[PDB]
């Protein structure tokens, strides 16, 4: 039917390093003469419950950080903290640094994650930021420091760095300025994901994709309004829709001829009676990790 | 719950080229001083119904093939045919050639596909060879020449090249010796996928993964035998199981303590009554594009 596709990972692979302090190793991101990694690399098992990061960091020598690219040591010559990241100054600029920028993404948006083990890339996956500010993700197990990204023609937009696994096994992390997505903290403490919800905009996008594919069976038999839509959505643990969501679906509506509120109607009826024994795009679930942007890029 | 992860694509990205003949463009694979591409690149719209490949090829000059790496022309200096592939000799060895080999995979096995547009990589996905020798794939739309692969530490095992879209929109292709998977032909003709089935071994693997994850709810309440298992499988359009499949599940059985025939029992009961309103690894479908090998690599 329709596959979740990740961005090609080559540009990011050449930026993955290992960073070791003491007995703790994780992944860092080497761009130009900086390596970024989770600041929790400086913690012992005992530090991790309530780490004095500022104190811990200022006590550390540059020599205490072992940064390896493959097997090659890059000497650190400065360290500073940025929110919940370390910015390590290294003695070599990465010759493989791509064109990049750093972006903070919004809940609901998608990105690719290059899962790594101690600086070795092992695989790539496509995911979304959940409304509860986690990633369901479930590979980032022990690959803290692994990064999430989007690629716009030649430019790499880094948007996530993995820091922690929460109790449910979902992943929590920061943007590349070191600011957590969601209310989580980089310590080993009592914290849980909020209740999650289904990304309604993304489901609508996927319903447009199904239309783009040639599916029309599920088109609405009745009209809805945004309010009446949101009463059902929520019974079904879907995120409520706003007019601004309605607008985002503009181009897809244009491409397909199926008005946005007609599609909201179709989703309401799919939820209440249609997805009983039926499939769309070959699937029995309503996919929510494709954005309107993703659908246009892949289905057009 | 559990994500399908593709291999990192960097090694393959640096091998993607565009090959043009006449008005037809597609992707080729540049390794050492050879470029491989679908031989149907030499066809016109009219050739494509019943192409005389041998004649077409022998009439062609080397100059008639435009091979571009990015925007850089590689001059072809010989062409020969290999089954349904062209092997073009080019004047430059790819400096980005990784360690590679070519393997033919079996139905049921998995691989990563780097989907490209006219030699530009656009995304990566993980899929399986269907029992009916197609890929459900649904991105390979206009990216003939795109390749499928597995990566074993440092070595790239190329196993697929995309050639055609069949009427259902599934993809058909060859191994890197140019031999089709399945009964398909590289012409525009009357040919269809066979009826497909569910990859039973892979579903069993995923049930082991669920156990590895901490799920035990679905464990069998009754015993089965291989024969009695295969009567149900088939009602449900699952591929029958053999003893050799039973054996392949050896290591997973070892790791989990759940005997293989106990897991077959659990699947039979999941099919007949358990997957009614319930989920495994967060999903309401029984996943069949993870092999026993994949599960060990990802869940261990």
């Amino acid at each position: 039917g329709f596959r979740k596709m990740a961005f090609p990972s080559g540009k990011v692979e050449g930026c993955m390093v290992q960073v070791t302090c003491g007995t703790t190793t994780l992944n860092g991101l080497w761009l130009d003469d900086t390596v970024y990694c989770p600041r929790h690399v400086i913690c012992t098992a005992e530090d991790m419950l309530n780490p004095n990061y500022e104190d811990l960091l200022i006590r550390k020598s540059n020599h205490s950080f072992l940064v390896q690219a493959g097997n090659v040591q890059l000497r650190v010559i400065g360290h500073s903290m940025q929110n919940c990241l370390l910015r390590l100054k290294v003695d070599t600029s990465n010759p493989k640094t791509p064109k990049y920028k750093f972006v903070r993404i919004q809940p609901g948006q998608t990105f690719s994650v290059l899962a790594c083990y101690n600086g070795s890339p092992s695989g790539v996956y496509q995911c979304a930021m959940r409304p509860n500010h986690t990633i369901k993700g479930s590979f980032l197990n022990g690959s803290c420091g692994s990064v999430g990204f989007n690629i716009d023609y030649d430019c790499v937009s880094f948007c996530y760095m993995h820091h922690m696994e929460l109790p449910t096994g979902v992943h929590a992390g920061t943007d590349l300025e070191g600011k957590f997505y969601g209310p989580f903290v980089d310590r080993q403490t009592a914290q849980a994901a909020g209740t999650d919800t289904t990304i309604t905009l993304n489901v609508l996008a996927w319903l447009y994709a199904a239309v783009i594919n040639g599916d029309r069976w599920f088109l609405n038999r009745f009209t809805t309004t945004l309010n009446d839509f949101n009463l059902v959505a929520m019974k079904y643990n879907y995120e409520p829709l706003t007019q601004d969501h309605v607008d985002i679906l503009g181009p897809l509506s244009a491409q397909t001829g199926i008005a946005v509120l007609d599609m909201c109607a179709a989703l309401k009826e799919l939820l209440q009676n249609g997805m009983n024994g039926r499939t769309i795009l070959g699937s029995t679930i309503l996919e929510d990790e494709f954005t309107p942007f993703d659908v246009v890029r892949q289905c057009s």
Side-chain angles (χ1 to χ4, degrees), chain A:
Chain A
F2 199 37
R3 258 195 209 287
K4 263 215 294 185
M5 224 161 36
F7 288 112
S9 55
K11 292 180 171 77
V12 182
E13 292 164 46
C15 311
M16 297 319 304
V17 295
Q18 188 179 13
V19 180
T20 309
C21 267
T23 54
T24 308
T25 291
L26 40 65
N27 297 294
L29 188 68
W30 186 22
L31 301 161
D32 308 306
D33 61 349
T34 308
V35 174
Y36 297 86
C37 72
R39 78 176 172 170
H40 76 248
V41 69
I42 69 186
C43 297
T44 57
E46 33 266 289
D47 291 326
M48 274 288 312
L49 291 101
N50 287 295
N52 292 182
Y53 277 117
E54 284 90 16
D55 182 65
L56 283 171
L57 185 64
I58 202 170
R59 279 155 165 58
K60 282 207 93 190
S61 75
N62 286 320
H63 311 287
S64 67
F65 292 105
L66 179 56
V67 180
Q68 303 171 92
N71 309 316
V72 162
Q73 190 189 156
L74 314 167
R75 202 183 140 186
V76 183
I77 60 176
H79 54 286
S80 59
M81 192 158 61
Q82 212 211 338
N83 295 309
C84 292
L85 292 174
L86 291 194
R87 303 199 284 199
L88 303 186
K89 295 330 280 295
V90 293
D91 67 349
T92 308
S93 298
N94 184 357
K96 304 188 193 273
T97 297
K99 203 176 175 163
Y100 70 92
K101 56 186 181 50
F102 296 159
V103 308
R104 200 176 167 81
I105 58 173
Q106 289 296 299
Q109 308 194 294
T110 54
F111 52 95
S112 282
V113 172
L114 177 61
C116 294
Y117 143 94
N118 307 347
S120 191
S122 30
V124 64
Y125 64 76
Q126 177 77 175
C127 61
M129 182 59 74
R130 295 317 300 182
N132 70 354
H133 305 281
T134 66
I135 298 175
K136 269 192 221 188
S138 202
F139 283 131
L140 268 166
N141 283 179
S143 48
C144 301
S146 280
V147 300
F149 63 95
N150 282 279
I151 297 175
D152 185 14
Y153 186 55
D154 56 345
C155 181
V156 178
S157 289
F158 294 106
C159 56
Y160 178 82
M161 182 163 272
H162 182 62
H163 289 248
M164 313 156 36
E165 293 100 68
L166 300 178
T168 37
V170 293
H171 308 289
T174 66
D175 65 23
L176 273 286
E177 315 272 278
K179 295 201 179 183
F180 261 90
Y181 290 97
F184 315 108
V185 285
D186 55 350
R187 43 184 186 280
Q188 191 66 241
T189 191
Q191 61 184 151
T195 59
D196 198 20
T197 51
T198 286
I199 306 154
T200 304
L201 176 69
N202 281 3
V203 179
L204 289 165
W206 187 77
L207 286 187
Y208 279 106
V211 173
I212 290 166
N213 180 220
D215 290 4
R216 315 213 109 220
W217 71 260
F218 55 79
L219 287 174
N220 57 303
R221 300 337 229 217
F222 308 84
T223 51
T224 204
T225 53
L226 224 60
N227 292 355
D228 295 345
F229 175 80
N230 279 341
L231 290 164
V232 181
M234 285 154 79
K235 297 185 137 87
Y236 280 86
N237 193 42
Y238 272 59
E239 165 159 34
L241 207 72
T242 71
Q243 179 64 42
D244 281 348
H245 290 349
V246 170
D247 294 334
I248 288 161
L249 287 167
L252 282 161
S253 188
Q255 279 167 35
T256 49
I258 292 168
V260 168
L261 264 296
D262 281 26
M263 199 65 89
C264 290
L267 177 57
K268 180 172 140 179
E269 303 167 17
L270 277 170
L271 289 175
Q272 298 178 306
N273 51 263
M275 291 305 279
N276 71 323
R278 295 181 189 102
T279 66
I280 295 177
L281 283 166
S283 135
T284 58
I285 83 114
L286 298 176
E287 203 85 321
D288 89 330
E289 312 208 337
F290 291 98
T291 63
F293 183 91
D294 294 344
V295 165
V296 173
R297 165 178 95 253
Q298 303 187 209
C299 319
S300 324

